[PDB]
Amino acid sequence: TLRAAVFDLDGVLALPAVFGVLGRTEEALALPRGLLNDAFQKGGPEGATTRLMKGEITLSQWIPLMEENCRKCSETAKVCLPKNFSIKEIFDKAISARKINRPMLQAALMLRKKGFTTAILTNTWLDDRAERDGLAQLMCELKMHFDFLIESCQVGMVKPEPQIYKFLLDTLKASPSEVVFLDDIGANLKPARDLGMVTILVQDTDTALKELEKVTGIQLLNTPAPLPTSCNPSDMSHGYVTVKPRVRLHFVELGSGPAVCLCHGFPESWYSWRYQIPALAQAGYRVLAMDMKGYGESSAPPEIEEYCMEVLCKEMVTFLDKLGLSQAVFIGHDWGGMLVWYMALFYPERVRAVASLNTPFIPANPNMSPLESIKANPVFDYQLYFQEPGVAEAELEQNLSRTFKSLFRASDESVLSMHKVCEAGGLFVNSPEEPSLSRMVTEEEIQFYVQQFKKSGFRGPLNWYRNMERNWKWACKSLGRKILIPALMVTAEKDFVLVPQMSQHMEDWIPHLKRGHIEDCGHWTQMDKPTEVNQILIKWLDSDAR
Amino acid sequence: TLRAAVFDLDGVLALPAVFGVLGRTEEALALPRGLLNDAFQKGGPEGATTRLMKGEITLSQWIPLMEENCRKCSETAKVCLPKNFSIKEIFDKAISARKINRPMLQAALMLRKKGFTTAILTNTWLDDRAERDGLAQLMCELKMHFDFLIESCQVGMVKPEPQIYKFLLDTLKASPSEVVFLDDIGANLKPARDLGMVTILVQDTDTALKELEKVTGIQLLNTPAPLPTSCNPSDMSHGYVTVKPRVRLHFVELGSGPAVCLCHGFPESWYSWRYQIPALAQAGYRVLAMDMKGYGESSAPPEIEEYCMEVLCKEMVTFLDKLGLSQAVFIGHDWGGMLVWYMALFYPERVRAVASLNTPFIPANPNMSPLESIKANPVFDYQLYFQEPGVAEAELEQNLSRTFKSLFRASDESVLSMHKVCEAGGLFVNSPEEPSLSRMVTEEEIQFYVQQFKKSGFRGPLNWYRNMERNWKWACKSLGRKILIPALMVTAEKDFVLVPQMSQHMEDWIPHLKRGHIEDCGHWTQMDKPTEVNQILIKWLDSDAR
Ligand SMILES: OCCSc1nc2ccccc2[nH]1
Ligand SMILES: OCCSc1nc2ccccc2[nH]1
């Protein structure tokens, strides 16, 4: 029966409320009780505050009208306002102190995933203060989680006028009895109640959530921690840059601040960073998540030598040049992590900082060919299977749904053994034809990868493995160098191929290397433990890349 | 006969040279003459500096080897180095002091436009210092003006080894007698001379340029000021964002720093900002030059009401939301300038600062319909001609080459009279069928606009003029507001329609408005006086938007 939930901003989704700060200001300045709240409401429907909430005047135009109201009120109360009394200073601190009420936002997100239409209906103003960016940032964070945002100053109506409630019902396409309305001001609930809406008076968050659980029948309060917010491909800004006549790179972009370039591995997509992109943008970075060469919407030339590290790194430098970026932080995973270590070794002036997930920095051995080293370790035997052009492509392209469902699994759900791949004559020889869906991915997420690989196939991606001698010869030029720019190595306890032990001598080459370690995490780090990855990257970026 | 010019970086394209700073450091610290230059070259081909220039070691690995060399040299000279002696400190200041030698860069640009292949051949290092960004920025600025950049540390060879000269000739595809080689180090010219190349020893810039003019036959020294660097559409990063199911906005992006959104007018393109985009990016801004709705690669729905200001402004806010930008500086020209004033009036929290080229802020009159005001001024008569759907489209789409050649002209080259357009029954009634090319545009630039308008035509663009009453009704809501965020109004002396006098009462609405004025400038401000626009915008951005 209930299918829509409406929340107020001030005092409900953001705490503390402005009215609460006015009461504390009166106590701190030993002013008569309610003086600032009376000046704020002076004139009712014809007063300055109603004109502000309706968008007739801006916040900066209202500030001197509110100060005049404070003086008129203090005069009738027979009191004097302190010498340094400033409405602007009081409001600046009140707005600045306001943070998202995480448990209330989590309840709204939970209701939305269960099919509820969610909205914010708020009495707010046109903020033209020099510090208005703080409010714009708060609104942008909240906005993305709600179906509708209705602000009084944009529609010319305020709560508790009954027409704003009729406007809300028309916008939601719902009858009053299907709506739950949460507000901390009792007067603002009365019109919603007259129409027949379920109302909840918000004094403390926990009691309001208990009422909300009771009326919706959905558990909201003691629920497990949700996954980080993920990307909707259709809502991203897609960028395209031609780095060479036949090569165009696609990326998705979000945020402002220092540039952070994310480099996925095999056989992945920019979409493998879906849980990191909003978190890193919200932390104050401009995120560029690439489709590496050979993948998704980036060019995929068939030639093997187009995928050697020297060419790939040169194109990443050109990518920065064409975007006008003198530097970027480079973060890679798997094949992308291999590339980011070589970007730091050959172009340190373009790399602000470097981080690798799972992939260690492995220096070339000038006495041993990489093909000889492959045979010495049965862990990397499967790479010999990837050498012959056409062989692994036919197996991997045969059934795309099976390829991604078999690969994208948690460490305890594995259906593949990377040893004896050449002996068996394939990667999926003793693997089921229809594997179960892993717990880390949904069918919808799998189908995104399937659609992306339907375009250029596996030739481009597999060609990254077919330049072993070319890469070895190139890497040998850097054997006298050290990596002396900020660097982070993140190991994954349960990675089958890139084991944490392979990273143990990295300090010899990167003396001030920082480390992160994720327990119970397999190869697909980003989607296996997204919350842990986000925390590790954000803390490192804030200390070593800012 | 000569068709390639090669320049060194240090001491030729960038001044002062490092070797010059070593000599000044010796004089300032009262060290024996040549001590630092001897330590720098200690060991010759097997020394630390050659290993640095070949890319074997990085700059940070070389610093302690150079300090050890300084001590070995001071010991044989029987002198003591001062207590605070630091090679890192000396090199940091030397690199920091180095600026582009503008007259030398201007000569290279002039040779390139006359058909010369240009290259930089330099002995340089892998810079991994914490301050390496300064060098990366210098290299990016220079890079874009040259066909090739050959760095010693990337190719493993140094000047004066003869194989780096053979490598250069192979890269240029030229024989030695077709090459002019400029360098400030005499020893580095000897191998080029042995091969038969024309060499110029650079001591002072003016004398080197006189030698270069004599040998090339091209005037380089007393030439007029060149136009700012312009965009090549194929080299830009193209971005696409879906703001609504049927509406996708295209933009080009360049640079890092605070976001600056450029909004073109009618009937233009993102390409109208071609001279501002590189200048604003080089000044430290992230430029987003839009294709406004109805234009180029942005969506162009046929419905009139899709182009009213309320809808357009709402979509620009969504554009910022999808990119993760809490704020942007908005700069508009013509119809774009109209939009940016309304962005500041309705969404001040999303607008960091606002600037308009030519378009004044004109408040709505609540007593007079905009269609009545149009008839009172014969200057705006042509807007009545744009009202009837289909009429102006057929005339403007008839011959696209004629439409753009007739419109894009300097104030003294006009072939159109905007008065009596309705009386004549068309905009081009007494206009030539094949007008001459204006001096502000080339045929190639005209053809870009022709190709862009071949896609969606003039319906979308003309629909911006067909929402007069809808826009008037919407603007009436803001009559009690003032614009109190940083604002710049730039007038153009010779604009036929948007005359500077129409902006004179703007201070009543924007009390702290800043102004710019461009003399002898017509309607097409950006391409008419690009250098003047750039200077005005950059100075304003650096003081009011940073
Ligand atoms: O360090 C290079 C990538 S190692 C590697 N990553 C893989 C992911 C999936 C299957 C085989 C793989 N082999
Ligand atoms: O302020 C709205 C645009 S005024 C206007 N700009 C034009 C450019 C070209 C032709 C007619 C024009 N009319």
UniProtKB/Swiss-Prot annotation, chains A, B:
Listed GO CC annotations: cytosol; extracellular exosome; peroxisomal matrix; peroxisome
E.C. no: 3.3.2.10, 3.1.3.76
Effect of R286Q: No effect on phosphatase activity; decreased epoxyde hydrolase activity
Activity regulation details: Inhibited by 1-(1-acetylpiperidin-4-yl)-3-(4-(trifl uoromethoxy)phenyl)urea (TPAU), 1-cyclohexyl-3-dodecylurea (CDU), 12-(3-adamantan-1-yl-ureido)-dodecanoic acid (AUDA), 1-((3S, 5S, 7S)-adamantan-1-yl)-3-(5-(2-(2-ethoxyethoxy) ethoxy)pentyl)urea (AEPU), N-adamantyl-N[']-cyclohexyl urea (ACU), 4-(((1S, 4S)-4-(3-((3S, 5S, 7S)-adamantan-1-yl) ureido)cyclohexyl)oxy)benzoic acid (c-AUCB), 4-(((1R, 4R)-4-(3-((3S, 5S, 7S)-adamantan-1-yl)ureido)cyclohexyl)oxy)benzoic acid (t-AUCB), 4-(((1R, 4R)-4-(3-(4(trifluoromethoxy)phenyl)ureido)cyclohexyl)oxy)benzoic acid (t-TAUCB) and to a lesser extent by 8-(3-((3S, 5S, 7S)-adamantan-1-yl)ureido) octanoic acid (AUOA).
Residue ranges occupied by any AB hydrolase-1 domain in the UniProt entry: 258-530
Region described as Phosphatase: 1-223
Keyword terms of this UniProt record: Acetylation, Aromatic hydrocarbons catabolism, Cytoplasm, Detoxification, Hydrolase, Lipid metabolism, Lipoprotein, Magnesium, Metal-binding, Multifunctional enzyme, Peroxisome, Phosphoprotein
Main location: cytoplasm
GO MF assignments: 10-hydroxy-9-(phosphonooxy)octadecanoate phosphatase activity; epoxide hydrolase activity; lipid phosphatase activity; lysophosphatidic acid phosphatase activity; magnesium ion binding; phosphatase activity; protein homodimerization activity; toxic substance binding
SUBUNIT field: Homodimer.
The name this protein goes by in its record: Bifunctional epoxide hydrolase 2
Native source organism of the sequence: Homo sapiens
